[PDB]
Amino acid sequence: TFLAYAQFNDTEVPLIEYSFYSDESLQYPKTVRVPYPKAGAVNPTVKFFVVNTDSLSSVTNATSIQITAPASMLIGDHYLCDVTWATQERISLQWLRRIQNYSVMDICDYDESSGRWNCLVARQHIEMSTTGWVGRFRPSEPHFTLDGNSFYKIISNEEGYRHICYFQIDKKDCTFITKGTW
Amino acid sequence: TPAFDKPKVELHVHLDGAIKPETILYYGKRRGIALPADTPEELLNIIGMDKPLTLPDFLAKFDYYMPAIAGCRDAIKRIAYEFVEMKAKDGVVYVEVRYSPHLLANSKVEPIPWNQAEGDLTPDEVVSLVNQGLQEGERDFGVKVRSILCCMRHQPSWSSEVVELCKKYREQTVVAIDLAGDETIEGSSLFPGHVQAYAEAVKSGVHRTVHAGEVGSANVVKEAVDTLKTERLGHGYHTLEDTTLYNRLRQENMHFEICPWSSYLTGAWKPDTEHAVIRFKNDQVNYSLNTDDPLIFKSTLDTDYQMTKKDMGFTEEEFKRLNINAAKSSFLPEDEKKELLDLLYKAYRMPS
Numbered sequence: 001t002f003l004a005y006a007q008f009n010d011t012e013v014p015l016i017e018y019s020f021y022s023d024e025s026l027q028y029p030k031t032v033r034v035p036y037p038k039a040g041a042v043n044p045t046v047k048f049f050v051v052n053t054d055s056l057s058s059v060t061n062a063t064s065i066q067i068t069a070p071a072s073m074l075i076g077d078h079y080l081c082d083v084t085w086a087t088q089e090r091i092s093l094q095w096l097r098r099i100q101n102y103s104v105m106d107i108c109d110y111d112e113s114s115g116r117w118n119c120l121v122a123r124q125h126i127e128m129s130t131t132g133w134v135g136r137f138r139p140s141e142p143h144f145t146l147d148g149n150s151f152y153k154i155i156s157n158e159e160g161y162r163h164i165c166y167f168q169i170d171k172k173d174c175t176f177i178t179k180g181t182w
Numbered sequence: 183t184p185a186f187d188k189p190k191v192e193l194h195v196h197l198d199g200a201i202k203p204e205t206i207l208y209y210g211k212r213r214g215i216a217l218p219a220d221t222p223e224e225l226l227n228i229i230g231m232d233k234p235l236t237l238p239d240f241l242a243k244f245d246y247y248m249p250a251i252a253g254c255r256d257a258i259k260r261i262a263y264e265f266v267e268m269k270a271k272d273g274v275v276y277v278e279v280r281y282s283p284h285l286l287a288n289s290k291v292e293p294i295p296w297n298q299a300e301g302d303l304t305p306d307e308v309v310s311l312v313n314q315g316l317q318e319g320e321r322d323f324g325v326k327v328r329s330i331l332c333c334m335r336h337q338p339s340w341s342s343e344v345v346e347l348c349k350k351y352r353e354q355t356v357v358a359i360d361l362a363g364d365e366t367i368e369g370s371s372l373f374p375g376h377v378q379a380y381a382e383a384v385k386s387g388v389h390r391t392v393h394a395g396e397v398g399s400a401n402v403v404k405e406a407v408d409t410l411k412t413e414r415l416g417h418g419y420h421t422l423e424d425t426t427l428y429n430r431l432r433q434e435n436m437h438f439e440i441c442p443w444s445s446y447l448t449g450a451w452k453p454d455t456e457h458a459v460i461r462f463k464n465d466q467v468n469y470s471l472n473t474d475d476p477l478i479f480k481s482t483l484d485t486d487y488q489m490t491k492k493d494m495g496f497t498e499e500e501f502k503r504l505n506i507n508a509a510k511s512s513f514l515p516e517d518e519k520k521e522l523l524d525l526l527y528k529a530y531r532m533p534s
C-alpha cells in the first residue's frame with residue numbers, strides 16, 4: 001500500500017576530488033568529484049516521507065507525507081539509521097545523534113482522519129551507551145510480532161553482552177529473553 | 183543570585199516569544215529567509231527591547247523572526263522542545279505555554295500570515311507537532327508541560343477551529359483556550375465567532391483564560407468574565423479602575439496572570455504608578471508571576487522575580503504563596519493538581 005523513502009540533502013557537504021585516467025585514448029584525465037564528509041566536516045541532512053501508492057493520480061502530483069525526526073534529534077546533526085515496517089499501517093524508525101551514543105526509536109501509525117503519520121511520543125524508546133557507541137555498527141533492527149504491538153531487538157545488557165530484548169510498544173522497559181557470557 | 187531559588191509555576195508564556203536566537207538564525211540560513219543580523223547575540227538586541235516602548239513597536243519585533251519559523255515542521259517541533267529546556271533552566275516545575283497555531287501554519291489559513299507563500303503545514307498539524315515537541319521536553323528535561331491554544335482578537339473566523347483543536351488534542355497536552363492579540367480593537371470581545379468558541383469551551387470542559395486589562399479599560403475585563411466566561415485573566419492590570427468588579431472578582435477568587443517585566447516593556451504600566459501588583463499582594467489576591475515573551479524582553483523568569491523582590495519588597499513568604507496559588511489555579515485535572523501542590527508544599531516545608 002505504502003512506499004516510504006528517505007531524502008538526502010548534500011548541498012553543503014564538501015567534495016572529495018581525484019583524477020580518473022580511463023582508457024589511454026582519453027587525452028585529459030577526468031576529475032571525479034563526490035560529496036563526501038570527512039571527519040567533523042559538514043554532513044548531509046535527511047528527511048523521511050511516506051506516500052500512498054493506491055491513491056496515485058496522473059492528474060495530480062503525488063502527496064508525499066513527511067514524518068519529522070524526534071525533537072531530541074533535531075537540536076543538532078543526526079542520522080536516520082533504521083526503517084522497519086511493523087504492520088500494514090505502522091512503521092518504526094530509528095534515529096541517531098551525530099555523537100553516536102544516543103539514539104531514539106519512533107513508532108508511527110497511519111491516521112485515517114488526517115492522512116498523515118502519528119508518532120506517539122509515549123511509544124518512543126530511548127537507547128544509549130555510556131561506555132561507547134550504540135550498536136555494533138549502528139542500532140539493531142527490531143523484529144515485530146504479527147500484530148505489531150511488541151518487538152524483539154538485540155541490545156547490550158548491563159554486563160555488557162549483546163542479547164535479545166523484548167519490548168511492548170508503549171511500556172518503557174524491556175525484558176531480556178537471553179543472558180550469558182556470549 | 184537566583185532571586186527566588188525554589189520550584190516555580192508559570193502560567194502565562196507565549197511560545198511565539200520564547201525562541202532561541204541561535205535556532206531562528208539556523209532556519210534563516212536554511213530557508214534563505216532574510217534576517218537583520220548574523221550573530222546570535224547581535225540578534226537578541228535587534229529583537230529585544232530594554233527601553234520600555236509601546237504595543238505597536240512591540241508587535242513589530244515579531245516580524246523580524248517569525249517568517250523564519252512558521253510553516254516549517256522541523257522548526258516547530260524544535261522550539262517547543264527547546265522551550266521546555268529553558269523553563270527547566272529557571273526554577274520551573276510546571277508550565278502552561280500559549281501560542282496561536284494559525285500564526286505558525288502556512289497552508290489552510292484565513293489570511294495566510296507573515297506574508298509567506300502557500301502552503302504545506304496545516305494548523306491542525308502545527309498543534310500536533312508542538313505537542314510532541316513538548317512531550318519530549320517534559321520527559322527529557324523533567325518539567326510537566328501543558329499548552330494553551332490562542333484565539334487572535336482580530337480574527338474571529340479562526341477561533342472556531344482553535345476551540346475544536348483544543349478539544350481533540352485534550353489528550354495531547356492542550357488544556358485551555360486563550361484570546362490574545364489586541365484588546366483595544368472596538369468590541370472585539372463580542373465578535374460572534376469568538377464568543378461561540380468560548381461557549382463551546384464551557385460546553386466541552388475546555389478551560390479558559392483571556393488577555394484583558396493589560397492596556398485596555400476595566401470593561402474589557404468585565405466582557406471577558408461575563409460573556410466569555412474566563413476562569414483566569416491574562417495580565418489584568420486596569421481592572422483596578424472599577425472597585426466593584428475588582429472586589430467581586432477577589433470574592434469569586436479570580437486568578438491574575440501577571441507579567442511584571444512585560445508590563446514595564448509593553449508600556450502597559452506607566453512607571454510613575456505603583457505597579458498594579460504591589461496592590462494585589464497587599465489585597466491578598468489570587469495571582470501568579472509569569473514572563474510573557476522572554477525572548478523579546480531579553481528575560482529569564484528570574485528577571486520577573488528580581489524585579490518584584492527589589493523594586494517592590496517582595497518576600498520569600500509571598501513568593502511561596504503566589505506559586506501555591508498559581509498551582510491551585512492551574513488547568514490540571516484534580517488529580518495532578520494535588521501532586522503539584524504536594525511537590526510545592528514539600529519543597530517549601532508546610533502542611534500537605
Ligand SMILES: *[C@@H]1O[C@H](CO)[C@@H](O[C@@H]2O[C@H](CO)[C@@H](O[C@@H]3O[C@H](CO)[C@@H](O)[C@H](O[C@H]4O[C@H](CO)[C@@H](O)[C@H](O)[C@@H]4O)[C@@H]3O)[C@H](O)[C@H]2NC(C)=O)[C@H](O)[C@H]1NC(C)=O
Nearest residue numbers: 007008009010011012045047211212213214215216217249
Ligand atoms: C537542501 O538544503 C539546502 C540548505 O543549504 C537548501 O538550499 C537552500 O535553499 C534555500 C531555500 O530556497 C535557499 O534560499 C533561497 O534562495 C533564493 C535565491 O538566492 C531566494 O530567492 C529564495 O526565496 C526567498 O526570497 C526572498 C528572501 O527574503 C523572499 O522573496 C522569500 O522569503 C523567499 O523565500 C530563498 O531565500 C538557500 O539559498 C539555500 N541554502 C544555501 C545557502 O545553500 C535546499 O532548500 C535543500 N533542499 C531540500 C529539498 O530540502
Ligand SMILES: *[C@@H]1O[C@H](CO)[C@@H](O[C@@H]2O[C@H](CO)[C@@H](O)[C@H](O)[C@H]2NC(C)=O)[C@H](O)[C@H]1NC(C)=O
Nearest residue numbers: 001002052053054055087088089090110112115
Ligand atoms: C493492504 O493494507 C492496506 C493498509 O491497511 C489496506 O488498505 C486499507 O483498506 C481498508 C479497506 O478494506 C480501509 O479500511 C483503509 O481505508 C485502507 N487504507 C488506505 C486508505 O490505504 C488494504 O486493505 C491491504 N490490501 C490491499 C488493498 O492490497
Ligand SMILES: *[C@@H]1O[C@H](CO)[C@@H](O)[C@H](O)[C@H]1NC(C)=O
Nearest residue numbers: 057058059060061062063064
Ligand atoms: C508537479 O510538480 C512540478 C514541479 O513542482 C510542476 O512543474 C508540475 O507542473 C506539477 N504538476 C501538476 C499536475 O501540477
Ligand SMILES: *[C@@H]1O[C@H](CO)[C@@H](O)[C@H](O)[C@H]1NC(C)=O
Nearest residue numbers: 099100101102128129130132
Ligand atoms: C556521549 O559521549 C560523549 C563523549 O564521551 C560525552 O560527551 C557524552 O557524555 C555522551 N552522552 C551521552 C548522552 O551518553
Ligand SMILES: [Zn+2]
Nearest residue numbers: 196393416474
Ligand atoms: Zn501575553
